[PDB]
Amino acid sequence: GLVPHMDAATAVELLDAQPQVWHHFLGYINSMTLQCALELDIADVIHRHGHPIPLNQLAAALEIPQTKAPFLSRLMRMLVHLGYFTQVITKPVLPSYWLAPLSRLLLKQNPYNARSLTFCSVHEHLVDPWRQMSAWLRTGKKDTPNAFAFAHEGKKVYEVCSEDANFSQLFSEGMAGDSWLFSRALVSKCRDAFEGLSSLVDVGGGTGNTSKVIAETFPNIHCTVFDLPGPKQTHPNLDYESGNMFTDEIPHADAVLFKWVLCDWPDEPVLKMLKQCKKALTKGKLMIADHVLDHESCNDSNSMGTSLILDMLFMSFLEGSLRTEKQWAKLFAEAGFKDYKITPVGGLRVLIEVYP
Amino acid sequence: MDAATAVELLDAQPQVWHHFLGYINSMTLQCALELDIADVIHRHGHPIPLNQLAAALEIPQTKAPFLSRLMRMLVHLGYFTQVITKPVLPSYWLAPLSRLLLKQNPYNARSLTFCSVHEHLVDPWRQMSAWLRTGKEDGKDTPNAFAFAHEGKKVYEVCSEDANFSQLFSEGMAGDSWLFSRALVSKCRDAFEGLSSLVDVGGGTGNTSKVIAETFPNIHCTVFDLPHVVSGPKQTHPNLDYESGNMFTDEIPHADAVLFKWVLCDWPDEPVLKMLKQCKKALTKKGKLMIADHVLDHESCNDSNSMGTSLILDMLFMSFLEGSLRTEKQWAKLFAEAGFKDYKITPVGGLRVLIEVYP
Ligand SMILES: COc1cc(/C=C/CO)ccc1O
Numbered sequence A: 001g002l003v004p005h006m007d008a009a010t011a012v013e014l015l016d017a018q019p020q021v022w023h024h025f026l027g028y029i030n031s032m033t034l035q036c037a038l039e040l041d042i043a044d045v046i047h048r049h050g051h052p053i054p055l056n057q058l059a060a061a062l063e064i065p066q067t068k069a070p071f072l073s074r075l076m077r078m079l080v081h082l083g084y085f086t087q088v089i090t091k092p093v094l095p096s097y098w099l100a101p102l103s104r105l106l107l108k109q110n111p112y113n114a115r116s117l118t119f120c121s122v123h124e125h126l127v128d129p130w131r132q133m134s135a136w137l138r139t140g141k142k143d144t145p146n147a148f149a150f151a152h153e154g155k156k157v158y159e160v161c162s163e164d165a166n167f168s169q170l171f172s173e174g175m176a177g178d179s180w181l182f183s184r185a186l187v188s189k190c191r192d193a194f195e196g197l198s199s200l201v202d203v204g205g206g207t208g209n210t211s212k213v214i215a216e217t218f219p220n221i222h223c224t225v226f227d228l229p230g231p232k233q234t235h236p237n238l239d240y241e242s243g244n245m246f247t248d249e250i251p252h253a254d255a256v257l258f259k260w261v262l263c264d265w266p267d268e269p270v271l272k273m274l275k276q277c278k279k280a281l282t283k284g285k286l287m288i289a290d291h292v293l294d295h296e297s298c299n300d301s302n303s304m305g306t307s308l309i310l311d312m313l314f315m316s317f318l319e320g321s322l323r324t325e326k327q328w329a330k331l332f333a334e335a336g337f338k339d340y341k342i343t344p345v346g347g348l349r350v351l352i353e354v355y356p
Numbered sequence B: 001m002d003a004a005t006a007v008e009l010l011d012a013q014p015q016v017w018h019h020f021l022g023y024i025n026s027m028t029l030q031c032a033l034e035l036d037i038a039d040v041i042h043r044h045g046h047p048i049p050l051n052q053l054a055a056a057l058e059i060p061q062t063k064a065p066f067l068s069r070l071m072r073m074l075v076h077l078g079y080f081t082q083v084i085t086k087p088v089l090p091s092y093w094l095a096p097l098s099r100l101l102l103k104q105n106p107y108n109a110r111s112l113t114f115c116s117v118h119e120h121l122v123d124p125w126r127q128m129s130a131w132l133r134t135g136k137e138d139g140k141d142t143p144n145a146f147a148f149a150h151e152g153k154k155v156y157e158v159c160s161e162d163a164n165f166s167q168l169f170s171e172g173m174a175g176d177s178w179l180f181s182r183a184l185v186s187k188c189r190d191a192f193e194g195l196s197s198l199v200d201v202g203g204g205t206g207n208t209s210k211v212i213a214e215t216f217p218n219i220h221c222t223v224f225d226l227p228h229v230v231s232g233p234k235q236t237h238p239n240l241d242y243e244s245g246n247m248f249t250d251e252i253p254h255a256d257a258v259l260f261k262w263v264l265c266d267w268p269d270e271p272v273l274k275m276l277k278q279c280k281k282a283l284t285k286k287g288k289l290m291i292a293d294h295v296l297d298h299e300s301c302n303d304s305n306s307m308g309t310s311l312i313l314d315m316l317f318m319s320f321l322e323g324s325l326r327t328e329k330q331w332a333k334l335f336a337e338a339g340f341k342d343y344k345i346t347p348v349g350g351l352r353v354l355i356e357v358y359p
């Protein structure tokens, strides 16, 4: 507890390095300010106004008392920096706010909005286990598959979802929203990968957002969503079968699609399932719509940072990871597949076609 | 919606993901500190293989693959490096940023990190929207979300109840002052010319005043802070001493210069103005006011990265303190209302500047 040389140049360098560290450890402030913006329906209230909205009118619409309007102003300034909104001053300080392009992803009226995924991701269920991550890392085989289970009395995310209907709904809605956008990019960027197919099984396809878009875009593909037992998407060439992809036989088709599924699981069950696909597809192909971590299409620093953040998220609450091409290729080889082709799609993700 | 628009939106989505997953940065860095990774690697003295690192951290070899993934994250963040040994089994070393993580360095950021990610500071954010919607007519309002989420208790009261949390905060401030003061006396040497005395209001355990006193032998430095803050180990020097009191309600010691380093940002305009008026009167009984703090819109912190961090601090302070990061306009207004006649801003670093304010 008692009190403990450096030249000025070094002191200044280190002083100027500190804010990078502050920015990292205060990262949760981004999470929480964005959540507030969603709780308050800020984007929707601004959109509804129809043109830039003055701070006082924004506060009134948000049921924020005028005494607290200066705090709202500061929250808005944060959200403007993050890229969601713009601000201007038309009175010679009352700003007026409008929408920036990134706010398209916040608007309730857009079926691709990220609201539910945001609420899910910042939920106590997903944040809290991180305070036991170090203890979990230090636990030998009191062990659990991940930090999430470690902090939930041994319960994996599937079990917690069955107990927490709200949390479960958020997760489901978040996946559906992503599928809305991803599928549309997929059928455009990878049109060639669907040519010549007459059937496809969408493993883990849920309410059918991915298959709906595939069926609409390629009218000769009979799509079957295969998943564990709201209303599901309707289309004449879209149907549904129930089953466990690990223990039940996957429906036969010209292509087996895994969209954001294999990343949830470790090598041993994935390999076992891939081998079963190998036996079944012999002759069709595997279609994996997921992350290839080191791929050229997502190798910029910002993209890599977000990929690694996802790898950490997945490490904490799922049983998988974001695999590199080398890791994928090793799984394909051991599963008996002979060839593969990667086509970039977007959103940190690609299509891998795998041939048996 | 056409394909081009769908792809554009798909490629924009990870920006939002990165925002809402910001707490992952907070928690992975906290893990690195809990596990003492920087010091373990430093003690090893050369790059350390993954298996040896797991052993050194008391992580079972069975969980080494998870450690590898945590390290990959931390390497991206810039704390560590992976030293390539072959054209698998990664070896890890230290990056320059890790200097701020090492326990042996008096300027390390460990305590501030632990303080900042603590439940006390994170949890009130889950009530921020409710607090923003609370009016002053139900008896439920509080000065900030922190108090709203702590049964009305401000951070000062929670610190008085939570000795560990309090110690983290104080150590955090001291570490920053160690660096900031050394930058201050170099980049703003002329600001100290001609002074015979200085009072460091909120100067804590004396890291700022110690450096001033050593660098400028004519300046008698007095740290003025709360009794409990100045009753323990602190910097000592023959021209440095400590006086105790409350800056809001007790008379601030007389000096040629009154210094506020990262203090006025904690408080709103009404008490700050009152205090500045008291200083104006004292400094013309001419002395000067010295404010070492953020000027939000200063050129030295205008880059996107710096502004992002400044706004994050502005949010942090909104949640648990009663202040903000002021713009030049806001500062200038305070100085005018307090009766000062001139000012000069000189950049120091760490998002902050020195404002000299003259009566
Ligand atoms: C629950 O939060 C998230 C989950 C995923 C999961 C993708 C595939 O299982 C991706 C991003 C998130 O923010």
Ligand SMILES: COc1cc(/C=C/CO)ccc1O
Binding pocket: A022, B112, B115, B116, B169, B262, B263, B265, B266, B313, B316
């Ligand atoms: C408790 O966490 C923090 C507090 C401050 C306070 C500075 C002046 O009062 C600055 C940065 C932090 O991370």
